[PDB]
């Protein structure tokens, strides 16, 4: 899905956006060409080569990283063991924060 990918990618230069595509093509291509002792294509039988979203996700996760920086690392590092509900104060605090967010949103 193109729109989903566009939503996922942010702070991406055009060169990054097209390198992402190149990397996805590269991994799909490698899928059907493999040999270690020698080199050999998949008997040219991979004429139905199709690129799946999984290739794009793997590339976006391991291949192409924006230079402008991101904020996933901080989120994952700060909320480590998640949030559980042991008492009302948690709900009260979350509600109050939401109220203040609404305040600043529409003041």
């Amino acid at each position: 899905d193109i729109k989903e990918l566009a939503v996922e990618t942010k702070n991406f230069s055009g060169a990054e956006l097209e390198g992402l595509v190149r990397a996805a093509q590269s991994t799909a291509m490698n899928r059907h060409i493999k040999a270690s002792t020698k080199v050999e294509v998949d008997m040219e039988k991979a004429e139905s080569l199709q690129v799946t979203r999984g290739d794009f996700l793997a590339s976006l996760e391991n291949d192409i990283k924006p230079a402008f920086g991101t904020n996933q690392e901080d989120y994952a590092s700060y909320i480590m063991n998640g949030i559980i509900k042991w008492g009302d104060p948690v709900t009260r605090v979350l509600d109050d924060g939401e109220l203040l967010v609404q305040q600043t949103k529409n003041s």
């Binding site: 994952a76 590092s77 480590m80 063991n81």
Partner: protein, 107 residues
Amino acid sequence: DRTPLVSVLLEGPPHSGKTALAAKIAEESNFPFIKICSPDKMIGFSETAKCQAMKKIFDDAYKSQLSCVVVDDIERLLDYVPIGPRFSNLVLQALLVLLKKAPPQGR
């Protein structure tokens, strides 16, 4: 795995054998990366130099899988002396901050 970071303080009167016991317990871990810092190898440095050295020592530990580090004679790291009292705040903050930063993921 819930607690990738663990700390511990050995305490006792002077001339007890703390340093040797720490070294032995560290040795019997069979870990890949082990390091033993100490005031003895930076004597006469200024505060900035000590902070740089502590930075460089800790940075290495972040580039392994599992590691153990030793900090002996803390009272010398920061120049404590009863009269006053007088000491270095910069090194103290370096230590306090560094003792609550978990390493990269899966380490």
